[PDB]
Amino acid sequence: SMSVKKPKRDDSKDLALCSMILTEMETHEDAWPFLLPVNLKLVPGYKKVIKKPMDFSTIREKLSSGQYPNLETFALDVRLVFDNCETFNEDDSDIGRAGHNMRKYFEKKWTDTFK
Protein backbone atom coordinates (compact mmCIF):
# COMPACT_ATOMS: atom_id res chain seq x y z
CA SER A 1 0.00 0.00 0.00
CA MET A 2 1.01 3.68 0.02
CA SER A 3 4.74 3.94 0.87
CA VAL A 4 4.83 0.22 1.79
CA LYS A 5 6.63 -1.64 -0.98
CA LYS A 6 6.95 -5.38 -1.45
CA PRO A 7 10.17 -6.86 -2.81
CA LYS A 8 9.75 -7.44 -6.55
CA ARG A 9 11.42 -9.82 -9.00
CA ASP A 10 14.19 -8.55 -11.31
CA ASP A 11 12.34 -7.99 -14.62
CA SER A 12 15.26 -6.52 -16.60
CA LYS A 13 15.74 -9.64 -18.73
CA ASP A 14 12.04 -10.35 -19.36
CA LEU A 15 11.92 -8.85 -22.87
CA ALA A 16 14.91 -10.88 -24.11
CA LEU A 17 13.68 -14.10 -22.46
CA CYS A 18 10.18 -13.76 -23.98
CA SER A 19 11.79 -13.14 -27.39
CA MET A 20 13.86 -16.35 -27.04
CA ILE A 21 10.79 -18.39 -26.05
CA LEU A 22 8.83 -16.94 -28.97
CA THR A 23 11.71 -17.87 -31.33
CA GLU A 24 11.53 -21.45 -30.05
CA MET A 25 7.80 -21.54 -30.76
CA GLU A 26 8.20 -19.97 -34.24
CA THR A 27 10.65 -22.71 -35.27
CA HIS A 28 8.75 -25.73 -33.87
CA GLU A 29 7.63 -28.08 -36.66
CA ASP A 30 4.02 -27.99 -35.39
CA ALA A 31 3.88 -24.15 -35.44
CA TRP A 32 2.52 -23.95 -39.01
CA PRO A 33 -1.18 -23.34 -38.15
CA PHE A 34 -0.22 -20.39 -35.91
CA LEU A 35 2.48 -18.45 -37.80
CA LEU A 36 0.13 -16.00 -39.56
CA PRO A 37 -3.39 -14.68 -38.88
CA VAL A 38 -6.24 -16.96 -39.98
CA ASN A 39 -7.58 -15.63 -43.30
CA LEU A 40 -11.00 -14.34 -42.27
CA LYS A 41 -12.22 -14.13 -45.87
CA LEU A 42 -11.33 -17.73 -46.72
CA VAL A 43 -12.11 -19.67 -43.55
CA PRO A 44 -15.87 -20.08 -42.94
CA GLY A 45 -17.08 -19.40 -39.42
CA TYR A 46 -13.82 -18.05 -37.99
CA LYS A 47 -14.73 -14.35 -37.91
CA LYS A 48 -18.05 -14.85 -36.10
CA VAL A 49 -16.93 -17.58 -33.69
CA ILE A 50 -13.47 -16.34 -32.62
CA LYS A 51 -13.89 -12.96 -30.93
CA LYS A 52 -10.17 -12.23 -30.40
CA PRO A 53 -7.93 -13.75 -33.11
CA MET A 54 -4.23 -14.10 -32.26
CA ASP A 55 -1.17 -15.65 -33.98
CA PHE A 56 2.64 -15.78 -33.58
CA SER A 57 3.46 -13.03 -36.13
CA THR A 58 1.09 -10.63 -34.34
CA ILE A 59 2.70 -11.46 -30.97
CA ARG A 60 6.16 -10.90 -32.51
CA GLU A 61 5.11 -7.47 -33.87
CA LYS A 62 3.67 -6.46 -30.49
CA LEU A 63 6.82 -7.61 -28.65
CA SER A 64 9.04 -5.67 -31.06
CA SER A 65 7.05 -2.43 -30.71
CA GLY A 66 6.62 -2.16 -26.94
CA GLN A 67 2.98 -3.26 -26.80
CA TYR A 68 3.36 -5.70 -23.85
CA PRO A 69 3.50 -3.84 -20.51
CA ASN A 70 4.81 -6.93 -18.69
CA LEU A 71 5.58 -10.64 -19.17
CA GLU A 72 2.06 -11.70 -18.05
CA THR A 73 0.34 -9.80 -20.87
CA PHE A 74 2.70 -11.65 -23.27
CA ALA A 75 1.70 -15.04 -21.83
CA LEU A 76 -2.01 -14.11 -22.07
CA ASP A 77 -1.66 -13.61 -25.86
CA VAL A 78 0.27 -16.87 -26.31
CA ARG A 79 -2.41 -18.81 -24.39
CA LEU A 80 -5.13 -17.08 -26.46
CA VAL A 81 -3.63 -18.68 -29.60
CA PHE A 82 -4.15 -22.14 -28.09
CA ASP A 83 -7.52 -21.34 -26.50
CA ASN A 84 -8.80 -20.18 -29.90
CA CYS A 85 -7.43 -23.37 -31.49
CA GLU A 86 -9.35 -25.57 -29.05
CA THR A 87 -12.57 -23.64 -29.64
CA PHE A 88 -12.45 -24.10 -33.40
CA ASN A 89 -10.77 -27.48 -33.91
CA GLU A 90 -11.52 -31.08 -32.86
CA ASP A 91 -8.84 -32.46 -30.50
CA ASP A 92 -7.87 -35.22 -32.94
CA SER A 93 -7.59 -33.08 -36.06
CA ASP A 94 -4.09 -32.19 -37.27
CA ILE A 95 -4.52 -28.54 -36.20
CA GLY A 96 -6.15 -29.57 -32.91
CA ARG A 97 -3.27 -31.86 -31.97
CA ALA A 98 -0.72 -29.24 -33.11
CA GLY A 99 -2.32 -26.78 -30.69
CA HIS A 100 -2.22 -29.19 -27.75
CA ASN A 101 1.45 -29.98 -28.52
CA MET A 102 2.45 -26.29 -28.73
CA ARG A 103 0.65 -25.40 -25.51
CA LYS A 104 2.57 -28.14 -23.68
CA TYR A 105 5.82 -26.95 -25.26
CA PHE A 106 5.18 -23.32 -24.24
CA GLU A 107 4.18 -23.98 -20.64
CA LYS A 108 7.35 -26.00 -19.95
CA LYS A 109 9.56 -23.22 -21.34
CA TRP A 110 7.57 -20.70 -19.31
CA THR A 111 7.90 -22.66 -16.07
CA ASP A 112 11.59 -23.41 -16.65
CA THR A 113 12.41 -19.77 -17.46
CA PHE A 114 10.42 -17.79 -14.89
CA LYS A 115 9.11 -20.20 -12.22
Ligand X SMILES: CC(=O)c1ccc(O)cc1
**Integer angstrom CA distances of residue 90 from 50, 80, 93, 96, 104:** 15, 17, 5, 6, 17
Window 18-47: residues binding ligand X (CB under 6 A): 33-34, 38, 43
The DSSP line for 43-105 is STTHHHH-SS---HHHHHHHHHTT--SSHHHHHHHHHHHHHHHHHHS-TTSHHHHHHHHHHHH
Question: Closest separation between CB of residue 70 and ligand X, Å?
Answer: 26
Closest CA to 15 of 81, 60, 79, 82: 60
Q: Near ligand X by CB under 6 A, which window of 20-28, 56-64, 69-77, 82-90?
A: 82-90
83 belongs to the binding site for ligand X (CB under 6 A): no
Q: Near ligand X by CB under 6 A, which window of 2-10, 14-22, 57-65, 84-92?
A: 84-92
102 belongs to the binding site for ligand X (CB under 6 A): no
Q: Which amino acid is at 75?
A: A
Q: Which amino acid is at 35?
A: L
89 belongs to the binding site for ligand X (CB under 6 A): yes
x/- map, 61-80, ligand X, by CB under 6 A: --------------------
Contact pick of 18, 59, 85, 102 for ligand X (by CB under 6 A)? 85
Q: Which residues bind ligand X (CB under 6 A)?
A: 33-34, 38, 43, 85, 88-89, 95
